[PDB]
Amino acid sequence: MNIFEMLRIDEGLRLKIYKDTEGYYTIGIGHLLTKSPSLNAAKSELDKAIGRNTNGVITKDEAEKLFNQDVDAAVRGILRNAKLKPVYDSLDAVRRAALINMVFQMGETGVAGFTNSLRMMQQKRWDELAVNMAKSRWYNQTPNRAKRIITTWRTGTWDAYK
């Protein structure tokens, strides 16, 4: 298992524009197009992202290209973030994937805000962390995914994904 396989499981793959769990226009493997309410606006973002007139549909290869770019941006994002980098550097390989996943989903800014959690991550207080992370809108809105991530943090294995 690796970061790509892990996010592919969490996000799924869709070739037509769709609304995420928060109602925003998305496509491919969890690629957010826009927060805006307008489909046309979303179709314009999509064309711009892909570089052609898509008509709201892309190919698997295009979805994977967006995914590659997205994962790379998440990692680089983490590494450039003052609050995130030190956390990431302190972790083992599986947990680094968990952090990447979270950042992919909620953005650098969202994760960087789990202040108390970040501290526990660094102190490697796994059990405390799992409890603290569950007290969040994030966990209440997408509990199954959050449980998978939390177990990952708690155990340091890919068991939740197997």
Query: d(Cα 108, Cα 75) in Å, to the nearest integer?
Result: 10
Query: d(Cα 131, Cα 138) in Å, to the nearest integer?
Result: 13
Instruction: Give least dist CB 143 to Cl ion, A.
Output: 6
Residue 132 annotated as binding site: yes
CA proximity to 98, closest of 13, 2, 31, 30 = 2
Residue 117 annotated as binding site: yes
Instruction: Give least dist CB 24 to Cl ion, A.
Output: 15
Q: Which long-range contacts (CB under 8 A, 24 or more apart) does 8-11 make?
A: 8/67, 9/161, 10/101, 10/105, 10/145, 10/148
Annotated active-site residue 72? The verdict is no
Binding site for Cl ion (CB under 5 A): 49, 142, 144-145
Residue 36 vs residues 79, 134, 152: alpha-carbon distances, Å: 29, 29, 33
Which of 10, 11, 45, 62 is the catalytic position? 11
Residue 104 annotated as binding site: yes
Nearer to Cl ion, 95 or 145 (CB): 145
Annotated active-site residue 11? The verdict is yes
Tokens, residue 139: 């966990």
Instruction: Give least dist CB 108 to Cl ion, A.
Output: 16
Residue 32 annotated as binding site: yes
Nearer to Cl ion, 140 or 157 (CB): 140
Nearer to Cl ion, 105 or 117 (CB): 105
| Residues assigned a catalytic role | 11, 20
As annotated, the binding site for substrate includes 32, 104, 117, 132
